[PDB]
Design an enzyme around this catalytic site. Structure first.
Site, PDB file in Angstrom:
ATOM      1  CG  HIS A   1      -1.720  -1.188   1.428  1.00 46.35           C
ATOM      2  ND1 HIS A   1      -2.822  -1.477   0.655  1.00 46.35           N
ATOM      3  CD2 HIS A   1      -1.590  -2.214   2.301  1.00 46.35           C
ATOM      4  CE1 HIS A   1      -3.343  -2.626   1.044  1.00 46.35           C
ATOM      5  NE2 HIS A   1      -2.611  -3.098   2.037  1.00 46.35           N
TER       6      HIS A   1
ATOM      7  CG  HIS B   1       3.257   5.742   5.679  1.00 48.20           C
ATOM      8  ND1 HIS B   1       3.097   5.635   7.042  1.00 48.20           N
ATOM      9  CD2 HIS B   1       2.125   6.308   5.207  1.00 48.20           C
ATOM     10  CE1 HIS B   1       1.899   6.079   7.378  1.00 48.20           C
ATOM     11  NE2 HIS B   1       1.300   6.522   6.282  1.00 48.20           N
TER      12      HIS B   1
ATOM     13  CG  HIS C   1      -0.733   8.399   2.110  1.00 46.74           C
ATOM     14  ND1 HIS C   1      -1.468   7.233   2.166  1.00 46.74           N
ATOM     15  CD2 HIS C   1      -0.312   8.645   3.371  1.00 46.74           C
ATOM     16  CE1 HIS C   1      -1.496   6.798   3.414  1.00 46.74           C
ATOM     17  NE2 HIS C   1      -0.778   7.621   4.158  1.00 46.74           N
TER      18      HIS C   1
ATOM     19  CD  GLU D   1      -3.878   9.351   3.257  1.00 46.70           C
ATOM     20  OE1 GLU D   1      -3.487   9.309   4.442  1.00 46.70           O
ATOM     21  OE2 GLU D   1      -4.434   8.399   2.681  1.00 46.70           O
TER      22      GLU D   1
ATOM     23  CG  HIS E   1       0.800  10.239   7.073  1.00 43.84           C
ATOM     24  ND1 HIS E   1      -0.209   9.512   6.484  1.00 43.84           N
ATOM     25  CD2 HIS E   1       0.486  11.542   6.912  1.00 43.84           C
ATOM     26  CE1 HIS E   1      -1.125  10.349   6.037  1.00 43.84           C
ATOM     27  NE2 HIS E   1      -0.733  11.585   6.293  1.00 43.84           N
TER      28      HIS E   1
ATOM     29  CB  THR F   1      -5.567   7.816   6.311  1.00 50.24           C
ATOM     30  OG1 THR F   1      -4.254   7.355   5.947  1.00 50.24           O
ATOM     31  CG2 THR F   1      -5.493   9.096   7.132  1.00 50.24           C
TER      32      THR F   1
END
Ligand SMILES: NS(=O)(=O)c1nnc(NC(=O)C2CCCCC2)s1
Ligand SMILES: [Zn+2]
EC number: 4.2.1.1
Length: 257
Positions: A61, A91, A93, A103, A116, A195
């Protein structure tokens, strides 16, 4: 299994994780004019000088840079937080295009990516116990915009070739996460959730106002990662972001006027 595709993406998660429709879900849009300055908010204390990174993992992911969290080595304190929160991993996104990927949004603006840094409240002993608590985690969120390179990100970028596919990990020691911070620690904060599934409502979110700049080449290398495992059909790891969720009965507080 949940993911970010048409058939298993965020709009599907509630079927296995009903909390997805909960009262304190993340991320959210940060409406800067409605966030209220809270003069009682303390400056953030980011104490990363003793951080011990260990490994980087493509988990299918995102990729996680993991830290030794068995002692108070890299901790987040102050701000809205009571007590001490230990850095366990960071990590990102990110999007398929520079115009999306974050996000959280700021006045509906999407950044190219969002970092994050995940910390757990040491009063709960371990991350697994902390996620069961409303004040179990503090996630420091940092927006990425595309412009000049972030030198402190390059060591991450350059190892990604070795973890292209889900389940691959690589040794990743001596990485200094201070190199990923912006200059200012001004922030917004609100109570929210993970999230990603299980979407637990255990996070104090601390989202920095100042984005970091990364280069187009750096973010391009994020987009060469794969959601799939080795030997499976290639699906580029892009758009691994959950969209903004309803704010519901929450106020976002700003550390700054
Ligand atoms: N996007 S996010 O809200 O920051 C997050 N969503 N799930 C998160 N899980 C974690 O950090 C862990 C995962 C596996 C083992 C330890 C810790 S972090
Ligand atoms: Zn995240």
């Amino acid at each position: 299994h949940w993911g970010y595709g048409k058939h298993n993406g965020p709009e599907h998660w509630h079927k296995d994780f009903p909390i997805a429709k909960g009262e304190r879900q993340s991320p959210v849009d940060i409406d800067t004019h409605t966030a209220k300055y809270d003069p009682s908010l303390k400056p953030l204390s980011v104490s990363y000088d003793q951080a011990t990174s260990l490994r980087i993992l493509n988990n299918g992911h995102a990729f996680n840079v993991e830290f030794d969290d068995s002692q108070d080595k890299a901790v987040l304190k102050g701000g809205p937080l009571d007590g001490t929160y230990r850095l366990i991993q960071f990590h990102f996104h990110w999007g398929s295009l520079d115009g999306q990927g974050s996000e959280h949004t700021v006045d509906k603006k999407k950044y190219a990516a969002e970092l994050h840094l995940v910390h757990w409240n040491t009063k709960y002993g371990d991350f697994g116990k902390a996620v069961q608590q409303p004040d179990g985690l503090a996630v420091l969120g940092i927006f990425l915009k595309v412009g000049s390179a972030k030198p402190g990100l390059q060591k991450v970028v350059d190892v990604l070739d070795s973890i292209k596919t889900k389940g691959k990990s690589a040794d990743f020691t001596n990485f200094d996460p201070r190199g990923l911070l912006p200059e200012s620690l001004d922030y917004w904060t609100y109570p929210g959730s993970l999230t990603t599934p299980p979407l637990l409502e255990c996070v104090t979110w601390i989202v920095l106002k100042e984005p970091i700049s990364v280069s187009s080449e750096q973010v391009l290398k994020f987009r060469k990662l794969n959601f799939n495992g080795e030997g499976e059909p290639e699906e580029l790891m892009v758009d691994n972001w959950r969209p903004a969720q309803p704010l519901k009965n929450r106020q976002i507080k700003a550390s700054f006027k």
